[PDB]
Amino acid sequence: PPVLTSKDKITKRMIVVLAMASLETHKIDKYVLLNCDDHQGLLKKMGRDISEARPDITHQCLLTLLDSPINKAGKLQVYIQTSRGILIEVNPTVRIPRTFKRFSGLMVQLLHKLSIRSVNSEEKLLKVIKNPITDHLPTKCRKVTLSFDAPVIRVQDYIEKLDDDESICVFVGAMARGKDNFADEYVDEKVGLSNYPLSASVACSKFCHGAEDAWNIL
Amino acid sequence: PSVQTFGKKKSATAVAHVKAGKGLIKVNGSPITLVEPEILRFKVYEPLLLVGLDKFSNIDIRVRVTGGGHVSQVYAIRQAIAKGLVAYHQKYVDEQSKNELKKAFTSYDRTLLIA
Amino acid sequence: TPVTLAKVIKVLARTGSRGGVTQVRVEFLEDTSRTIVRNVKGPVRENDILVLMESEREARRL
Amino acid sequence: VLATPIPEEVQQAQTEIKLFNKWSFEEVEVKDASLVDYVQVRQPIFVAHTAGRYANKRFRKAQCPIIERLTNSLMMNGRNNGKKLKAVRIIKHTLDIINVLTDQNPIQVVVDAITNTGPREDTTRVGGGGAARRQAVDVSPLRRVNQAIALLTIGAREAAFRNIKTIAETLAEELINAAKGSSTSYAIKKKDELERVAKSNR
RNA sequence: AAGGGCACCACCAGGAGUGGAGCCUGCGGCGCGCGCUACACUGACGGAGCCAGCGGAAACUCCGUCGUGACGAGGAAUUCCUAGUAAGCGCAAGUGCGUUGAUUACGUCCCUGCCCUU
Numbered sequence: 001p002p003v004l005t006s007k008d009k010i011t012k013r014m015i016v017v018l019a020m021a022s023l024e025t026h027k028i029d030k031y032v033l034l035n036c037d038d039h040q041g042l043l044k045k046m047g048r049d050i051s052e053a054r055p056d057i058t059h060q061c062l063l064t065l066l067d068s069p070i071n072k073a074g075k076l077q078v079y080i081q082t083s084r085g086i087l088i089e090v091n092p093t094v095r096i097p098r099t100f101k102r103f104s105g106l107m108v109q110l111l112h113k114l115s116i117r118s119v120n121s122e123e124k125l126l127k128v129i130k131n132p133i134t135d136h137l138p139t140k141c142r143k144v145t146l147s148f149d150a151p152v153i154r155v156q157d158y159i160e161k162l163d164d165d166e167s168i169c170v171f172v173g174a175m176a177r178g179k180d181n182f183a184d185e186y187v188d189e190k191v192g193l194s195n196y197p198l199s200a201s202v203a204c205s206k207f208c209h210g211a212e213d214a215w216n217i218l
Numbered sequence: 219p220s221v222q223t224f225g226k227k228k229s230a231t232a233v234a235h236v237k238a239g240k241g242l243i244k245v246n247g248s249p250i251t252l253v254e255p256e257i258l259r260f261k262v263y264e265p266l267l268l269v270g271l272d273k274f275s276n277i278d279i280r281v282r283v284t285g286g287g288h289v290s291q292v293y294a295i296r297q298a299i300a301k302g303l304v305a306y307h308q309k310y311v312d313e314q315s316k317n318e319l320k321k322a323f324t325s326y327d328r329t330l331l332i333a
Numbered sequence: 334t335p336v337t338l339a340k341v342i343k344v345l346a347r348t349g350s351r352g353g354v355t356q357v358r359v360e361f362l363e364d365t366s367r368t369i370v371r372n373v374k375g376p377v378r379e380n381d382i383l384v385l386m387e388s389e390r391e392a393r394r395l
Numbered sequence: 396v397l398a399t400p401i402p403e404e405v406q407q408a409q410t411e412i413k414l415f416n417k418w419s420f421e422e423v424e425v426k427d428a429s430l431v432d433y434v435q436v437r438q439p440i441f442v443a444h445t446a447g448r449y450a451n452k453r454f455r456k457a458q459c460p461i462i463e464r465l466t467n468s469l470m471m472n473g474r475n476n477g478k479k480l481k482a483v484r485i486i487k488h489t490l491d492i493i494n495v496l497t498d499q500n501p502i503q504v505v506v507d508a509i510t511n512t513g514p515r516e517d518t519t520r521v522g523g524g525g526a527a528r529r530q531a532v533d534v535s536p537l538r539r540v541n542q543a544i545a546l547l548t549i550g551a552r553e554a555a556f557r558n559i560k561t562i563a564e565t566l567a568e569e570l571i572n573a574a575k576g577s578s579t580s581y582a583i584k585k586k587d588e589l590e591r592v593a594k595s596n597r
Numbered sequence: 598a599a600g601g602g603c604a605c606c607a608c609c610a611g612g613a614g615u616g617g618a619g620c621c622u623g624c625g626g627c628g629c630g631c632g633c634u635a636c637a638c639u640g641a642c643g644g645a646g647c648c649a650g651c652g653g654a655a656a657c658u659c660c661g662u663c664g665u666g667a668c669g670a671g672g673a674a675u676u677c678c679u680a681g682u683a684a685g686c687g688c689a690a691g692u693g694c695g696u697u698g699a700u701u702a703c704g705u706c707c708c709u710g711c712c713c714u715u
Contacts, residue, residue, distance in 0.1 A: 185527060188595065
């Protein structure tokens with residue numbers, strides 16, 4: 001089961017980009033991720049970043065995606081895209097840390113070193129890469145933005161319409177609120193998935209489920 | 219009854235004697251099939267093939283070179299063989315033969331006559 | 334696709350535009366009757382092929 | 396005969412037609428109006444190693460044989476700068492590989508790839524009002540040619556990187572796939588996407 | 598406010614990078630700049646071919662052998678740039694020289710600046 005990366009420009013696959021992700025280190029003399037639990041005090045004092053500190057959402061989404069069959073089947077890769085404009089590629093075989101405390105440690109280290117390397121292997125597990133995301137994407141790739149205010153779709157149907165050699169890239173806002181335009185400049189359209197507002201993770205399961213159904217994944 | 223010219227490129231030069239004879243073509247004391255950047259080779263056949271290889275029946279072309287890179291010599295001696303040949307026809311054969319060779323070369327390239 | 338080729342008549346001498354893009358009056362080359370104002374991206378002088386798909390578009394300062 | 400031999404395959408092919416390395420220029424037509432006058436296949440040449448100067452005036456570069464234009468674009472990423480002799484070799488080989496894989500004039504094959512590669516409507520970065528929106532411009536025939544050559548060489552070069560192939564090969568691959576159109580070619584895929592994008596900005 | 602202009606410390610279209618590693622070296626302080634060496638097959642090794650200029654050079658070419666077996670090609674930022682030039686290459690001299698040799702620009706006032714005149 002060949003591991004999918006940006007280097008491969010041909011394979012048909014599903015890509016999720018967790019746009020607008022809240023990852024930021026915090027000094028204190030030790031480092032941690034800026035996050036609404038520890039730093040709601042500080043954030044308010046400064047009078048900003050009100051919910052600009054939700055790295056947990058990213059964490060949730062990641063577990064949700066990598067834990068998914070479509071990932072296990074090797075038909076999915078993920079990318080991150082930080083509020084501050086940092087882009088990350090996520091090796092699909094990475095067993096991301098289960099808890100947020102351990103997640104934080106590792107994201108703090110990834111951000112400072114720009115990559116996370118397997119202790120025995122020379123392929124990275126996470127890698128900071130250069131914008132724009134559209135260089136690293138497959139050549140024939142449909143690009144959409146998930147949005148509550150966009151026309152609702154059935155993902156299974158939305159997917160069966162894709163050319164047999166055409167990938168699908170979905171941008172999810174990994175955040176608590178905000179305009180869904182974090183990607184207007186790249187996408188072909190925006191779609192809704194439910195008549196109910198969803199959380200990023202749920203949008204993500206919903207979409208994986210759908211691809212899993214349509215691409216025959218159990 | 220000789221005439222001579224010379225051709226130039228970047229930092230090389232080539233001198234070409236023309237005098238009438240049995241019809242051979244020489245570079246540094248070597249026949250011309252052995253000039254060895256090997257892919258630019260036909261590039262020096264070009265003053266032969268743009269004219270027709272009957273003109274080279276009665277004449278003889280001694281050529282020797284100095285200096286420059288290993289492209290410079292080839293450009294040099296194609297220029298020098300062209301100017302030498304038109305020189306020979308100009309001085310010992312009719313003016314109009316000189317005109318046909320001149321316009322015939324000039325339509326193909328311009329480097330052959332002006333360095 | 335009903336692709337239609339055109340020929341430039343007049344690149345404009347005084348304009349107003351964003352840099353890079355220039356407006357061109359085109360003669361239509363199937364008939365001589367139609368003339369359009371269009372927008373080109375690359376550097377363009379007179380008398381050449383233009384590939385057209387959308388056939389009117391009547392564009393303006395961009 | 397003259398005092399210093401000069402071979403048969405030389406004497407012949409040469410003075411008769413003025414073939415390529417040894418391919419005929421006559422009978423290759425620019426299967427696309429517009430783009431003629433810009434794809435230069437009408438003044439024939441033995442090697443793609445012209446020592447001319449196409450930089451002084453704005454469009455002189457069109458009078459440059461498209462073959463040699465292709466071969467110049469080959470010579471890049473810093474390590475390959477100035478290495479035309481290499482390029483000329485690569486080009487020669489490619490042509491052969493192309494002809495083995497379809498008879499044809501591989502130079503016709505080259506022309507076509509350049510012919511059916513250029514975009515029709517490229518997108519400019521209009522103002523937008525902050526969250527910028529691209530606007531559907533048409534593109535010039537010189538750019539069409541320019542960009543094509545660009546695409547196919549960046550294709551071959553970067554196309555077949557860590558693998559078991561030679562640029563000559565991967566250039567034949569990229570030129571053959573594009574000289575027909577069958578979504579197997581990184582330049583065709585790219586053109587069709589630049590264009591799909593344009594119909595979106597209309 | 599108006600009309601002209603000029604400019605990659607502007608824009609329109611690219612190249613080469615710098616900002617990543619260790620080390621060398623200068624500067625600060627008690628982080629910053631110039632560099633050197635690096636992470637193969639468009640290669641390496643062996644023959645062989647064999648060409649400069651300033652004061653039988655290397656890259657390179659051909660024929661063979663080998664056969665994919667800290668740093669894994671550099672974050673946010675950001676510099677300079679229009680032909681024998683850029684880059685590559687080596688050479689003499691205490692900065693010069695030649696060899697190989699390009700892609701892109703030669704456009705505009707949309708933007709940021711400045712200049713002119715009103």
